Amino acid sequence: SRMQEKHMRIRVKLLDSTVELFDIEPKCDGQVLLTQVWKHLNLIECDYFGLEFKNVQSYWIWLEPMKPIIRQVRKPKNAVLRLAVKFFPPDPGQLQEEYTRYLFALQLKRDLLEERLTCTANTAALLISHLLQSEIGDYDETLDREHLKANEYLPNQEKSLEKILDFHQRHTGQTPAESDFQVLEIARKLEMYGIRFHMASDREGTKINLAVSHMGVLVFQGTTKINTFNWSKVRKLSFKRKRFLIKLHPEVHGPYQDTLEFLLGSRDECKNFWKICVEYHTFFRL
């Protein structure tokens, strides 16, 4: 006999791609699972992190700490979630623990592989060369080529093999911590560092990509950044159905207007973007 409810088995894909299994009562709030994961990892700076899952609409959503797990994931038999950085600070090299910096380097590795973190060809190759130094150590042509055959860093990485090898040869003797630090140093200056797009349209019907960062709410047209609504200028964030509302400094040359509106693809996509913006503001401001 059991004095607890039957537990659900949840697979958690970690940042190194290993999978750990966690058994939890479906009615438990997300925090229960989050804390088991932080313990398994001995992750001190856990406030930067979350667990995410992919919905039927194929987009990633964050596990909420104060809602029952079963109501969020819905799959009693095989819930799968993955560890991810939620909050990207401007200077991750200044994170307090080597372990946290290690996890951030792994996150950036994933964002490069998944084509979220974009950059010039040489810069991508340089990033990968430091990732190689951290994982397999000093350059050797055979060791590098065999590793790159069995481990993916970028789609069509073979195009950049020569550049990757060339840069790796420069990193002789560098430790994994040094290598992670270099990954963070290179990545943090990239326009796409920590960026996840949420598709929307503006007042004129132009298709844009919304994002949020430690600096504020961001607007991209295609891949080009066209606005930064800095937190200091943001008075309120709201949403109604598919509409995302930013209350901001008013326009100078027009009848008084303090609010910009963007239309997302659905109520829930809108709500999810609103949520991450509010969370970013709380994390990085006051």
Numbering used by the authors: 37 to 322
Describing publication, verbatim:
We determined crystal structures of the FERM domains of zebrafish FARP1 (zfFARP1), mouse FARP2 (mFARP2) and zebrafish FARP2 (zfFARP2). As expected from their high degree of sequence identity (>60%), the structures of these FERM domains are very similar to one another, with root mean square deviations within 1.0 Å.
FARP2 also interacts with PlexinA family members, contributing to both Plexin-mediated repulsive axon guidance and dendritic development. In particular, the FERM domains of FARP1 and FARP2 contain a Lys-Arg-Lys-Arg (KRKR) motif in the loop connecting strands β5 to β6 in the F3 subdomain, which is highly conserved in FARP1/2 from different species. Interestingly, both the FERM domains of mFARP2 and zfFARP2 form similar head-to-tail packing patterns in the crystal lattices, as a result of interactions between the positively charged and the negatively charged faces of the proteins. These packing patterns lead to a linear array of the FERM molecules, which may cause the oligomerization and precipitation of the proteins. The linear packing of the FERM domains of mFARP2 and zfFARP2 in our crystal structures suggest a potential mechanism for the oligomerization of these FERM domains. The KRKR motif in the FERM domains responsible for phospholipid binding is buried in the oligomerization interface.
